[PDB]
């Protein structure tokens, strides 16, 4: 089997990425935020506290023939931006682009933080990172791609961001027309949960490619591209007026100017970032101060290629036995 759906940025600035999902029978779609770091499936639902719902469709269980409760189990996650969810679970029906999955566990937010519930625009998440992250209690619970897997004509999914436009995400095979050039191959460790790579450097705009390791994760569900203190200052150094705003919380730059690219490798291989992907826009509403896009790691314990590097991409995501992660040029 094969699935293919359409992602779609929730805003003007790419800040994340929905795509539907049928929950349930008779379905009900939901507009679920697919993250590669992280490992549960929840949704805004009708036990979702009411004063913690603001716009978001809900998943209510008992209007599904298919749903079932999972006795006992309960779940509850933290993410990286500080935001968080909990709830119980129930096994429904689930598909994606085509792709189903009978018994996916679903797990029904009875609380959810305050940044969940001023994004109207995001229903829940997709977890798509390795099962050993999945939060559920007592019972750990698989992804959708981990239960879909053997029944998939290939191993695998692919993420194919848009720059403020809508992609695709497919499951169970790779689509050829979707990329230029080749794919190159490059080893993930799953030790820490993630599809944890190591790229072979980076170079700033028309600059030298400079050889180093920099290991960090593939992570649709994270904006930016977070990186070591000394490669972003590197580039935000070729950017006139750009300082590092402890107020604003990172990188900041003049909104007039024009910023270069940045490029980092895989293998051999190299993808450049375009410039453009790397503006946020203006820190406040009118303000001339914008936001950058890339920004240190430093003190999140982990460097993550984020959508600002994904989107610039055709990314594999390949499950097999020893997973890998292959990027190409688009």
Request: with cysteine; hydrophobic share 35%.
């Amino acid at each position: 089997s094969t699935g293919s759906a359409t992602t779609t940025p929730i805003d003007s600035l790419d800040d994340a990425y929905i795509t539907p999902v049928q929950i349930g029978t008779p379905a009900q779609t939901l507009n679920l935020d697919f993250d590669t770091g992280s490992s549960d499936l929840w949704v805004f639902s009708s036990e979702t506290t009411a004063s913690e719902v603001d716009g978001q469709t809900i998943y209510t269980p008992s209007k599904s023939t298919t749903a079932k409760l999972l006795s006992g189990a309960t779940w509850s996650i933290s993410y990286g931006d500080g935001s968080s969810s909990s709830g119980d679970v129930y096994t429904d029906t689930v598909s994606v682009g085509g792709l189903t999955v009978t018994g996916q566990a679903v797990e029904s937010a009875k609380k959810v933080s305050s940044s969940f519930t001023e994004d109207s625009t995001i229903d829940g998440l997709l977890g798509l990172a390795f099962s050993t992250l999945n939060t559920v209690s007592p019972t750990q619970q698989k992804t959708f791609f981990d239960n879909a897997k053997a029944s998939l004509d290939s191993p695998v999914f692919t993420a194919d961001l848009g720059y403020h436009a809508p992609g695709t995400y497919n499951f169970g095979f790779i689509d050829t027309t979707a990329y230029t050039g080749s794919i190159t191959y490059t080893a993930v460790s799953t030790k820490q949960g993630f599809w944890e790579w190591t790229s072979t450097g980076y170079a700033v705009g028309s600059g030298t490619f400079k050889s180093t390791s920099i290991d960090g994760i593939a992570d649709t569900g994270t904006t930016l591209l977070y990186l070591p203190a000394t490669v972003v200052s590197a580039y935000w150094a070729q950017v006139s007026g750009a300082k590092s705003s402890s107020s604003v919380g990172g990188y900041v730059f003049p909104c007039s100017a024009t910023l270069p690219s940045f490029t980092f490798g895989v293998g051999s291989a190299r993808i450049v970032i375009p410039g453009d992907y790397i503006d946020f826009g203006p820190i406040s509403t009118g303000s001339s101060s914008c936001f950058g896009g890339i920004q240190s790691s430093a003190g999140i314990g982990i460097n993550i290629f984020g959508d600002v590097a994904l989107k610039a991409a055709f990314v594999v995501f390949n499950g097999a036995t020893t997973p890998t992660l292959g990027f190409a040029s688009k």
